[PDB]
Amino acid sequence: SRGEYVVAKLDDLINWARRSSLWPMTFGLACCAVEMMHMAAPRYDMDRFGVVFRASPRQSDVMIVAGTLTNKMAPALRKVYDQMPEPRYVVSMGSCANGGGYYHYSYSVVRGCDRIVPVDIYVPGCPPTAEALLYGILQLQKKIKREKRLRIWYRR
């Protein structure tokens, strides 16, 4: 049909523009911040993918939770998540953000940031390398590329 073709091409356009202009807000909590900074450093250079370095939280498209989430900061994480405009994504970077990690059995650590915010990409490592984080960001772009917002809207 014509309408299905039109909403498919518009889905492809808006998914292209969203995955090719991802703006991150990095929670530089712990040691994974150093490796996000290496993913911004000139060897890997996220800025050539259209992924800018340190966009403000009220204009960013993806929240990279890079470090250990403690109990004292989990409401601040959730408040910054609630202040992000949609579509917002969450990359969980490294073991403490993924599942608690080396501080999993601690009294003061949230056992993974997925107890606090919905998470799209889990990037494993302690820390994951800057290349592994850039792999996770390209996998997030591939996840955005196969979104079907207007096709489901046309089929609802």
Partner 1 sequence: TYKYVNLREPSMDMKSVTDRAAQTLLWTELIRGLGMTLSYLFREPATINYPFEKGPLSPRFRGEHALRRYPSGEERCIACKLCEAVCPAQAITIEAEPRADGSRRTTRYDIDMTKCIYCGFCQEACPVDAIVEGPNFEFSTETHEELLYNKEKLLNNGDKWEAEIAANIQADYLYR
Partner 2 sequence: MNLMITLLTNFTLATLLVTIAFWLPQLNVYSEKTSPDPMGSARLPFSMKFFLVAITFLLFDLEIALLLPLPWASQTTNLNTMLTMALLLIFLLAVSLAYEWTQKGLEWTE
Partner 3 sequence: MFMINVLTLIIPILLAVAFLTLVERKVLGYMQFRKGPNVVGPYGLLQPIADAIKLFIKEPLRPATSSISMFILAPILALTLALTMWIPLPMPYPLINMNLGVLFMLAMSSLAVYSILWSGWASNSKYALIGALRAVAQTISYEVTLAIILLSVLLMNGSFTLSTLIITQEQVWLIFPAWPLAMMWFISTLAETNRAPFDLTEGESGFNVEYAAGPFALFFMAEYANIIMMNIFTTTLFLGAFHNPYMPELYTINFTIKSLLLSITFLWIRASYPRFRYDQLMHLLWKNFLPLTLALCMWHVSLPILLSSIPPQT
Ligand X SMILES: CCCCCCCCCCCCCCCCCC(=O)OC[C@H](COP(=O)(O)OCCN)OC(=O)CCCCCCCCCCCCCCCCC
Ligand Y SMILES: CCCCCCCCCCC1=C(C)C(=O)C(OC)=C(OC)C1=O
Residues of this chain that interact with ligand SF4 (CB under 6 A) are 30-32, 67-68, 94-96, 101-102, 126-127
Instruction: Determine contact, residues 84/25, Cβ cutoff 8 Å.
Output: yes
The Cα-based distances of 76 to 38, 59, 65, 90 in angstroms read 25, 17, 12, 15
Residue 50 found at the interface with ligand X (CB under 6 A): no
Q: Which of residues 66-85 bind partner 2 (CB under 8 A)?
A: 82-83
List residues binding partner 1 (CB under 8 A): 42-45, 48, 95, 98-102, 104-105, 112, 114, 119-126, 128-132, 134-136, 138-139, 143
List residues binding partner 2 (CB under 8 A): 82-83, 86
